[PDB]
Amino acid sequence: QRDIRSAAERATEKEKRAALVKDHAVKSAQVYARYYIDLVESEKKARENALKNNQLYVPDEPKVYLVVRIRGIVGVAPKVRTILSLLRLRQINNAVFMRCNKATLNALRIVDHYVTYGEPTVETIRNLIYKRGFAKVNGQRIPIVDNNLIDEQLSKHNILCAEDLVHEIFTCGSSFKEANNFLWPFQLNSAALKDKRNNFAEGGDFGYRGKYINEFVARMI
Amino acid sequence: LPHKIIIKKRKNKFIRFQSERFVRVKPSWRKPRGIDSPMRHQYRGQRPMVSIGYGSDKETRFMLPCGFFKHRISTVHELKTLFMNNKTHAAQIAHGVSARSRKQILEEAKKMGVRVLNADAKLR
């Protein structure tokens, strides 16, 4: 890419863009804090109102999972190897985000005994991105330390700072694919297990954990 | 000139396998190549194997403990030419130069402010 404008014009436009990004960041942070609080309160109110009327309130199903690889690379069957390659889980103790459909769920079930997964919270997502966040730019692994990089690479999808990225991941918005692939897979610290050989349901370790993924990973960030 | 601290990743030399049990086998390094060789497999008790990775930081590679770079000379002309960067390079007189030539070379070097590593040799 070749730029025609002089150095001073670039400097001035860069400063203008930075100011715009800062303002957007402040506004979005306030808005999203309000949104999270409101979500929790509305769910509680729905539960109470339904309860008075001899009815059960069934909440929404999880839309995004957090899956982490817990088994190594020696002696792996071919189909499992392919599926794990397509999730970008090529090393032990790596982690990624994943949208939920029947297409993705069936593949996850096939690779079950190599991973553990569940539904994350906003706090987990924010900690992961702030402390272990790196960007894939032209095939390089670039650290994320400020909102300028996010704005430069993801502006065309209305993503201008860390708050928008967190919100897009949590809500599984219309730009989940680009935002998710913009992130390099997380390289976490070593994992504390109970028994790598068996499913979480029967006291083991692999498979579906639900909300306990949050503590399991909080130990690792 | 000031420089970084010199680190040597290994202090001892790499000795050839089994050279302590036979006089006919010299200690100079050779790569082990047997089908059953235990040093090729690198079992826990064997001696270390040569590899890239032991390499020195290239900022201080070839630097003598005094902090200079070595330059071997044998004539007074060789000294005068190619010693304008006297900051980092020191002179070493070759083995075969005689005592008269050594006297002349030392006088010239002292005039030019160039360091000589083997200045005391052949002085009895």
Binding site: L56, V58, A201, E202, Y208, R209, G210 | -
Partner: protein
């Protein structure tokens, strides 16, 4: 360490069954993942509904009080190495969740049966006048007394830190 859960479940509505019947069960488990697993385990066998054809409407944790002591009767079936057997047991505890722990430990120690080898049929609270087992009965009476069953344990426990002592300690009783 068990909890007690109430789980609601239903088969997904179809075109010929717009509003399927709902089922409720009581489950004792160490967490809610295990609770839902056991719920589906029983629903598949008793009502021919698999996890894939149904949905779970609510898994609500319920905490008891735990002040006084009650007598619990537990009816169960377990599989051994030679088939299956029914069994009635009596336990004395402060909560029904604590009684299940005692029952599971006794089954593990005496019969060698693990969690997934046992099916709890019913758990009820029994009055002091209709106890069936002799140990619980002898502990339901009034003014019951006995000496300390293992006072050597206190002396043994203190010797781990004080290795060498100037006399052999006595065991007070």
């Amino acid at each position: 360490m068990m909890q007690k859960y109430i789980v609601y479940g239903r088969r997904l509505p179809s075109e010929k069954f717009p509003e399927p019947e709902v089922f409720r069960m009581t489950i004792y488990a160490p967490n809610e993942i295990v609770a839902k697993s056991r719920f589906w385990y029983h629903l598949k066998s008793l009502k021919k509904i698999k996890r894939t054809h149904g949905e779970i409407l609510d898994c609500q944790h319920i905490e008891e009080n735990g002040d006084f002591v009650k007598n619990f009767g537990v009816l169960l079936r377990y599989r051994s190495r030679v088939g299956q057997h029914n069994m009635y047991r009596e336990v004395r505890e402060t909560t029904s969740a604590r009684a299940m722990d005692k029952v599971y430990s006794e089954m593990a120690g005496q019969c060698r049966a693990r969690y997934h080898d046992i099916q709890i049929i019913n758990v009820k609270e029994v009055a002091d006048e209709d106890v069936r087992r002799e140990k619980v009965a002898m502990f339901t009476q009034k003014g019951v007394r006995f000496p300390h069953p293992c006072p050597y344990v206190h002396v043994k426990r203190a010797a781990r830190t004080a290795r060498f002592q100037d006399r052999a300690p006595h065991v007070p009783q």
